[PDB]
């Protein structure tokens, strides 16, 4: 399953995930593909920040959905 992450450079990142993947684990994949350390990442879907412990299904994030990365200040 492919999901997208838009960052504020305008770049779209494509990730390979399954609905059972925790947000922690998604953040790890971003560090793999982009170099950004998990601890500076924040992930937004709908308009609300996503919790580390929980899953993509828990938030109902399906095939082709878009999260938004926003770094910590």
């Amino acid at each position: 399953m492919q999901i997208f992450v838009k960052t504020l450079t305008g770049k779209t990142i494509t990730l390979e995930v399954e609905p059972s993947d925790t947000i922690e684990n998604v953040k790890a994949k971003i560090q793999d593909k982009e170099g950004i350390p998990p601890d500076q990442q924040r992930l937004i879907f709908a308009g609300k920040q996503l919790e580390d412990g929980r899953t993509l299904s828990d938030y109902n994030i399906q095939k082709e959905s878009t999260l938004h990365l926003v770094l910590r200040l």
């Binding site: 504020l8 305008g10 926003v70 200040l73």
Partner: protein
Amino acid sequence: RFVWTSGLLEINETLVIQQRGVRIYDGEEKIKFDAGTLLLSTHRLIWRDQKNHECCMAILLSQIVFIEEQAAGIGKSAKIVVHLHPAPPNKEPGPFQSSKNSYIKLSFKEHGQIEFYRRLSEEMTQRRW
């Protein structure tokens, strides 16, 4: 990121909250700049300078990615930090957008930040536009 506006509200646009005494900083600045009345409507955040001139300036709420509060230390009241979706383009310049930073900061010099932060949150959640 801000565009000119007359200040009037469009047909199905309602005023939610307004506040005097708000300054808008750019990214990590700490003296630019502006000082004035902030309006939140159902569709837009509108700024309007103290004694006019000019202004008004507004951004669409759909342009807001995320918001958060940031402490002033042992002061009185937090800054609201607003993260904006980027523009584009349009081919040629460019240069690199990574060395530019992409949020604005609202400071509330005459208070009312908590109330504003709450209203902004609810407008972000409800997306009434």
